[PDB]
Amino acid sequence: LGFLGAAGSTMGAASMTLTVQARNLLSLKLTVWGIKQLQARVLAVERYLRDQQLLGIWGCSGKLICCTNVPWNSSWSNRNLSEIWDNMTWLQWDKEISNYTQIIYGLLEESQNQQEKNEQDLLAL
Amino acid sequence: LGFLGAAGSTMGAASMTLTVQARNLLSLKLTVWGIKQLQARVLAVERYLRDQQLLGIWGCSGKLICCTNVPWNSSWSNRNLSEIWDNMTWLQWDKEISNYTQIIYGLLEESQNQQEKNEQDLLAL
Amino acid sequence: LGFLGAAGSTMGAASMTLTVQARNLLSLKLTVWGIKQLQARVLAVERYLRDQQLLGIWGCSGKLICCTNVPWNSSWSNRNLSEIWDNMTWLQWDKEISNYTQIIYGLLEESQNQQEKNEQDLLAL
Amino acid sequence: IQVTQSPSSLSASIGDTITVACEVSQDVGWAVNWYHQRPGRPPYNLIYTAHNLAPGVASRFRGSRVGTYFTLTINNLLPEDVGTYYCQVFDSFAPGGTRVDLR
Amino acid sequence: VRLDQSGTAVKKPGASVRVSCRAPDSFTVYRPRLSAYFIGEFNIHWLRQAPGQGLEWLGFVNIFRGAVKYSSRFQGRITITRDTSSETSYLDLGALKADDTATYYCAWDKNVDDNPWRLDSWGQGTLVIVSS
Amino acid sequence: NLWVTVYYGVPVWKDAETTLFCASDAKHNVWATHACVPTDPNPQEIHLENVTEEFNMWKNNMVEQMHTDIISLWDQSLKPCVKLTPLCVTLQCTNVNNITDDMRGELKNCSFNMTTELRDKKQKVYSLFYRLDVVQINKEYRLINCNTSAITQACPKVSFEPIPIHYCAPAGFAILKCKDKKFNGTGPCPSVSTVQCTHGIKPVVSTQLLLNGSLAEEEVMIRSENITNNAKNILVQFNTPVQINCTRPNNNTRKSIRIGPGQAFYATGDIIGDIRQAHCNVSKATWNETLGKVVKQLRKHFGNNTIIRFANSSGGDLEVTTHSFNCGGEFFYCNTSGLFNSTWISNDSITLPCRIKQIINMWQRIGQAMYAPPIQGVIRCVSNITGLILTRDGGSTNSTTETFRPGGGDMRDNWRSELYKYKVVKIEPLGVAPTRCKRR
Amino acid sequence: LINCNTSAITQACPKVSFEPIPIHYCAPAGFAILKCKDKKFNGTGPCPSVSTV
Amino acid sequence: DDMRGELKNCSFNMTTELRDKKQKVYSLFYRLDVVQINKEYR
Ligand SMILES: *[C@@H]1O[C@H](CO)[C@@H](O[C@@H]2O[C@H](CO)[C@@H](O[C@@H]3O[C@H](CO)[C@@H](O)[C@H](O[C@H]4O[C@H](CO)[C@@H](O)[C@H](O)[C@@H]4O)[C@@H]3O)[C@H](O)[C@H]2NC(C)=O)[C@H](O)[C@H]1NC(C)=O
Ligand SMILES: *[C@@H]1O[C@H](CO)[C@@H](O[C@@H]2O[C@H](CO)[C@@H](O[C@@H]3O[C@H](CO)[C@@H](O)[C@H](O)[C@@H]3O)[C@H](O)[C@H]2NC(C)=O)[C@H](O)[C@H]1NC(C)=O
Ligand SMILES: *[C@@H]1O[C@H](CO)[C@@H](O[C@@H]2O[C@H](CO)[C@@H](O[C@@H]3O[C@H](CO)[C@@H](O)[C@H](O)[C@@H]3O)[C@H](O)[C@H]2NC(C)=O)[C@H](O)[C@H]1NC(C)=O
Ligand SMILES: *[C@@H]1O[C@H](CO)[C@@H](O[C@@H]2O[C@H](CO)[C@@H](O[C@@H]3O[C@H](CO)[C@@H](O)[C@H](O)[C@@H]3O)[C@H](O)[C@H]2NC(C)=O)[C@H](O)[C@H]1NC(C)=O
Ligand SMILES: *[C@@H]1O[C@H](CO)[C@@H](O[C@@H]2O[C@H](CO)[C@@H](O)[C@H](O)[C@H]2NC(C)=O)[C@H](O)[C@H]1NC(C)=O
Ligand SMILES: *[C@@H]1O[C@H](CO)[C@@H](O[C@@H]2O[C@H](CO)[C@@H](O)[C@H](O)[C@H]2NC(C)=O)[C@H](O)[C@H]1NC(C)=O
Ligand SMILES: *[C@@H]1O[C@H](CO)[C@@H](O[C@@H]2O[C@H](CO)[C@@H](O)[C@H](O)[C@H]2NC(C)=O)[C@H](O)[C@H]1NC(C)=O
Ligand SMILES: *[C@@H]1O[C@H](CO)[C@@H](O[C@@H]2O[C@H](CO)[C@@H](O)[C@H](O)[C@H]2NC(C)=O)[C@H](O)[C@H]1NC(C)=O
Ligand SMILES: *[C@@H]1O[C@H](CO)[C@@H](O[C@@H]2O[C@H](CO)[C@@H](O)[C@H](O)[C@H]2NC(C)=O)[C@H](O)[C@H]1NC(C)=O
Ligand SMILES: *[C@@H]1O[C@H](CO)[C@@H](O[C@@H]2O[C@H](CO)[C@@H](O)[C@H](O)[C@H]2NC(C)=O)[C@H](O)[C@H]1NC(C)=O
Ligand SMILES: *[C@@H]1O[C@H](CO)[C@@H](O[C@@H]2O[C@H](CO)[C@@H](O)[C@H](O)[C@H]2NC(C)=O)[C@H](O)[C@H]1NC(C)=O
Ligand SMILES: *[C@@H]1O[C@H](CO)[C@@H](O[C@@H]2O[C@H](CO)[C@@H](O)[C@H](O)[C@H]2NC(C)=O)[C@H](O)[C@H]1NC(C)=O
Ligand SMILES: *[C@@H]1O[C@H](CO)[C@@H](O[C@@H]2O[C@H](CO)[C@@H](O)[C@H](O)[C@H]2NC(C)=O)[C@H](O)[C@H]1NC(C)=O
Ligand SMILES: *[C@@H]1O[C@H](CO)[C@@H](O)[C@H](O)[C@H]1NC(C)=O
Ligand SMILES: *[C@@H]1O[C@H](CO)[C@@H](O)[C@H](O)[C@H]1NC(C)=O
Ligand SMILES: *[C@@H]1O[C@H](CO)[C@@H](O)[C@H](O)[C@H]1NC(C)=O
């Protein structure tokens, strides 16, 4: 397949073709077309940089799938793992947890910071 | 706390709230306001990238705090650890070591490259 | 030395002083000069970011030298290792690989992704 | 504010060094200016801000502060320098001025 | 900046005198931001030198809006103005006295923030003589 | 034994230059606020404990940058407006007619010739011009700017009102706000708090007094550079506003005539009703109280024994010697002599005559001159007098009385009051520090 | 001339063509265009056959 | 002898400050900058 090929597929199928669609995240005078193109280019760069920084803060920079250390509170979604990994599509799963998204980001950031501080303390000795 | 919250605090508090003040490093015609805004956005992106590349050279990308392999020459500062981390603010330390920054940056760069080369040579086995 | 110092030198000397040119990869009205400089800066950032994309997809973010886990297919270049690393400068090497880059690039990313997946499946236990 | 400038007059040889001073009654930072006037000629600027050199004049001229005591030093006197000297601060001007002449 | 003054003037007591100080091609300053010529913020001072006496500061005019400031001793009898079209500055002294005779200089001040009251360019000087 | 560690996102900042962008809260305005990024309803505001930072209102670059900005917007709003060159024609003017003794000869009924929509014909058109806009060569007059600079008419749909704009630095930069209520011009500010970006700043255009703007918190403050310097100005900031009502009690109908294909020019039609004189009112008791507070806070830098006298300006152009400002798309120059008459020593209102101008050349530009279009109906505006631009007068050492007069002209001094409590700084999120760890 | 009493008539340059050359609209990086491949798609609503471009 | 007709003293009727009256004004032009139609040149 190619870009966005398996969007409607299952978590199981989509979770193995991250690279094929992650690769395509980045791809004159002062006329209207020129200024529009320049603005679009810089906006795409800014969006990608925001996402990359968000990856980096949780200690997952340069990793397509990284594991974390924050527990999954069942209040977000109590559904069984197999159910959500064998039937749904990614769009439905994202729609389900849309409102529970800032909280998990904050928990992840605090967990990574605490883990990093602990790692430094251990590496002191 | 918040952005720059621990600015007046000592080392102990500031060295644990890095993420909160690192989260906000990144956040249409040819009108004066428009061009000013575009230049500002590009400048912010360029500054962030410069800092991130400097981090990547020292082999600490994706880490808030990382340890290195060169020792602290007393020529830079003779102050002991305890009062350094419990007595003075970050700004004071920066003003104290500002004029020594280039050579220590070079030391980190060279040491990281040497460590990478040695690790590659060892892995060659 | 300086920027591009070992450009004509052999493999060994260049492979020891990468960081001298890695660090030099990143360094108002709407007149001709203004738009020209803005386009130049945006283009430089975009090129460095595409380079960072290609490095990150290979799981070597922040590393000047990283190793992979794919065989060197002799169909690309079946030449003796010692003569490659003691005779041909990087330029001639590129002129003898330039036809074969895309495929190997893809191989890299695929392997990396697969490796990551496998690693995750290992860590779930 | 009042400015007192000393000495009223002085005499010197060729090539020697001299000093002319003035005290201002307040604290004025380094906002002192030095002016020289040849006889029958319009005065021209030499020292501005009490430690900078005006363009188009010799480097033998110098000026400095010590507390509120501003002074101008001349080295290697060349007898075209015969004339008058004044220090200005802000709006006030030093009364009289100091006249320098050869022996 | 080259500064051209007026000529020698002789006036009887009780009259009025006027001295013209021309500073050609120096009132306007480029503003590279907008890329246009704006009237500068420079100052024109007026000094006098009595025969055998130190200089005395009369007053100065910021030529941007023509603002003025006179020495309180001469207040009420001296007017200072500028004409931007011909790039000149006019001093108007009223009801001169016998001691008013002197050499009157016009001086240019760059009005830079760092250096205060720096008068760089000086006019050739004018001879204003009053007698009966 | 020690080692070095790098820290990202370290709270270090250094004062630095930086371009800032406007941001307002949601009509074409002369300040292009429609291009400003909308601001968040709740701006973030973070206090900083144990933080002491130096400030310098006079070395601040924010005022210079924002002055350059305001100039740029002012010119840009004029570029797509009607050219007014064909107005420079001989004007047959007569005196105007139910007029009080004050406005005798200050309004001219001028008839002249104009090029119509076509070109083979010309039309006789009459209009009303203020005396300050015409000069003699019925009598033949001509516009005041005909032998110097060109005239461009401001399009009569741009609101000249100052809509507040917040200046905001991009990411990686911060703004520091001095919360110290007793903060003079420069020096350390113990109560300093960071902010995302500036508060509501009104680009009010005025010369002698400060209109609207922002007030103090504790009491009236006197901020300046060296108060010893007669040349340097004196900014004043009040603790309570002085309510000033300025109005033009003429009906002042507007007549739209055609001077070119598509381009149209708006002239002053015949005034309906009595022709009075535009004037301003300030509460006498409130003004006396404000002046007393000002002199009490001002005696600190001069001594109780010293005498303080307020006098009207010593001379200059119409836009400095008088109180010049803009109200409702019109320009006023108020005599203001009655506002400075005290001789402070150890219900009634103060009417101020005002004059109206239409050929405006603010920020003197060699070649340009705005023509302010007439405004229909009587015009009135209530404003807050908040600060004064005073200037000292050099005196003899023996003399013990200091005379203060209104000044201005240099709009940087006007604009520094609204940005005196802000500093633009660059965040340096990279630090190095010695720890005992050693990387594997 | 008709518009001379209200407008400011300007002549189009002679050599500039008015013929509509086909153009393509492209979204920047990080964005996609979803095209409804379905041939029975009325005004609004779901389109079961979506293709990216 | 090298300026025989090279410099032309040309006068015209450029408008004065106000755009209603004409004023006779003279100037000098280089022969390469004028074309004939004293005589008339443009
Ligand atoms: C200090 O701030 C105060 C508060 O804003 C400010 O007072 C305002 O002054 C303006 C200036 O005229 C007033 O605006 C007018 O309001 C009346 C009543 O609503 C309107 O009828 C007027 O309409 C005219 O202007 C329109 C502009 O597009 C035209 O379209 C229209 O046809 C009319 O010609 C005009 O908007 C305003 O009412 C007051 N009050 C408030 C609350 O805004 C004061 O001016 C400021 N001080 C200054 C600027 O020195
Ligand atoms: C553009 O035209 C105006 C009006 O004609 C010019 O202003 C006028 O300039 C003359 C120059 O001689 C002034 O005359 C002077 O008047 C004073 C009294 O104020 C008198 O003492 C002098 O001897 C002299 O006669 C006149 O006052 C002045 N009027 C105004 C209203 O400004 C202006 O200079 C012209 N600009 C040009 C030609 O660039
Ligand atoms: C300035 O002067 C002009 C010139 O008169 C005034 O404009 C209007 O001019 C017309 C023709 O010249 C006047 O029309 C005549 O009015 C008289 C009296 O009303 C009438 O008897 C005639 O039959 C003819 O209609 C017209 O009156 C005049 N406008 C007014 C209001 O009278 C212009 O009004 C003058 N500006 C002023 C007075 O502010
Ligand atoms: C510019 O010129 C055009 C062409 O004349 C003007 O449009 C015309 O305007 C007049 C008056 O506004 C209209 O006259 C009216 O016509 C109706 C019939 O439709 C009649 O019943 C009325 O009694 C009145 O006479 C005329 O219709 C109109 N023509 C068109 C084609 O719209 C226009 O107003 C002018 N613009 C200006 C002067 O700014
Ligand atoms: C250019 O080529 C020459 C020779 O091909 C290189 O000289 C070598 O220098 C190293 C460093 O001392 C010696 O160990 C080798 O023995 C030299 N080569 C020979 C054949 O003796 C030189 O380093 C190359 N690069 C530059 C920048 O000159
Ligand atoms: C008077 O004005 C001068 C203008 O320079 C001030 O002098 C500067 O003061 C700053 C302190 O903020 C110093 O860093 C500069 O080096 C000074 N420069 C000069 C040329 O003096 C001065 O502080 C002001 N006040 C007084 C009392 O003089
Ligand atoms: C504004 O307040 C600051 C804080 O006190 C003043 O700074 C000091 O003021 C005292 C008294 O005037 C001086 O003795 C010190 O030398 C000042 N500090 C420095 C570093 O020079 C400052 O002077 C005040 N500004 C004005 C105009 O009064
Ligand atoms: C100013 O002039 C306007 C225009 O004539 C006046 O408004 C008119 O007032 C009359 C009665 O006074 C009404 O019959 C009209 O309908 C109004 N409008 C027009 C377009 O004529 C206004 O009254 C005058 N005085 C003011 C504004 O104080
Ligand atoms: C400013 O104050 C003056 C005097 O207090 C006001 O003038 C009076 O206004 C009223 C109502 O308009 C008239 O009836 C009077 O005839 C006016 N004159 C006098 C002497 O009372 C004026 O209206 C005030 N203007 C503003 C805008 O407040
Ligand atoms: C300026 O205008 C304001 C508002 O119209 C006037 O304030 C009014 O004053 C009267 C008498 O003092 C009171 O009865 C009203 O309640 C006030 N209204 C408001 C909204 O404040 C004020 O008097 C006018 N003149 C001055 C000098 O401020
Ligand atoms: C400031 O106030 C003084 C008060 O005397 C004004 O001086 C008088 O102004 C009139 C105006 O025509 C002259 O006729 C008098 O001759 C002036 N008197 C003197 C002694 O010169 C002065 O004009 C005012 N300044 C302003 C309003 O800018
Ligand atoms: C500004 O206002 C003052 C005072 O209202 C005016 O001074 C008056 O001038 C006239 C004519 O010269 C004298 O008869 C009065 O005696 C003056 N009054 C005072 C208090 O001195 C002055 O002329 C006005 N200036 C302008 C430019 O309007
Ligand atoms: C003039 O000053 C008054 C002072 O009270 C201003 O009124 C205050 O405005 C602030 C901000 O808009 C509010 O937070 C206060 O609640 C207001 N207080 C009162 C008593 O009204 C007024 O906004 C200023 N500007 C004007 C009148 O245009
Ligand atoms: C779509 O649904 C079918 C139904 O089983 C499934 O086989 C397929 O993998 C799904 N995804 C794609 C991309 O076809
Ligand atoms: C300010 O300093 C005091 C010193 O006693 C300290 O206790 C306090 O925590 C500091 N403030 C902050 C915000 O850390
Ligand atoms: C203010 O009021 C006091 C009360 O007597 C008076 O002495 C003083 O002159 C007044 N100041 C003015 C009107 O400026």
Residue numbers in the entry:
A (entry chain D), B (entry chain F), C (entry chain B): 520 to 546, 566 to 663
D (entry chain M): 2 to 91, 96 to 108
E (entry chain I): 2 to 35, 35A, 35B, 35C, 35D, 35E, 35F, 35G, ...
F (entry chain E): 33 to 58, 65 to 134, 136 to 138, 147 to 184, 188 to 306, 309 to 321, 321A, 322 to 397, ...
G (entry chain C): 193 to 245
H (entry chain A): 148 to 184, 188 to 192
Task: Give the exact sentences the study uses for this entry.
Broadly neutralizing antibodies (bnAbs), capable of neutralizing diverse HIV-1 strains and subtypes, represent promising tools for immunotherapy and prevention. bnAbs target conserved epitopes on the HIV-1 Env trimer, including the CD4 binding site (CD4bs), glycan-dependent sites at the V3 base and V2 region, the gp120–gp41 interface, the membrane-proximal external region, the fusion peptide and the silent face. VRC01-class members, encoded by the immunoglobulin heavy chain gene segment IGHV1-2, include a five-residue light chain complementary-determining region 3 (CDRL3) and are characterized by high somatic hypermutation. To elucidate mechanisms of Env recognition, we determined single-particle cryo-electron microscopy (cryo-EM) structures of a BG505SOSIP.664 trimer unbound (2.9 Å) and in complex with representative Fabs from each expanded B cell clone: 04_A06 (3.8 Å), 01_D03 (3.2 Å) and 05_B08 (3.3 Å).
Contacts between 04_A06 and the adjacent protomer were mediated exclusively via a protruding CDRH1 in 04_A06, a consequence of the 11-residue FWRH1 insertion, which also contacted the primary protomer. Its 34-residue CDRH3 is inserted down the trimer symmetry axis and contacts protein residues and the gp120 N160 N-glycan of all three protomers, resulting in a well-resolved glycan density for the core pentasaccharide of each N160 glycan and additional glycans in some cases. Mass spectrometry analysis reported that the gp120 N160 glycan is underprocessed, containing a mixture of high-mannose, hybrid and complex-type N-glycans. In our structure, density was not observed for a core fucose, a component of complex-type N-glycans, nor could clear density be discerned much beyond the core pentasaccharide, the latter a likely consequence of limited resolution, glycan compositional heterogeneity and/or glycan flexibility. The ability to accommodate and/or interact with the three gp120 N160 glycans on an Env trimer, whether or not processed beyond high-mannose carbohydrates, likely contributed to the enhanced breadth and potency of PGDM1400. Our structure recapitulates key molecular interactions between PGDM1400 and Env recently reported, such as the interaction between gp120 K169 and heavy chain Tys100F, electrostatic interactions between an Asp-Asp-Asp motif at the tip of the PGDM1400 CDRH3 with gp120 R166 of all three protomers and extensive glycan density at gp120 N160 on all protomers.
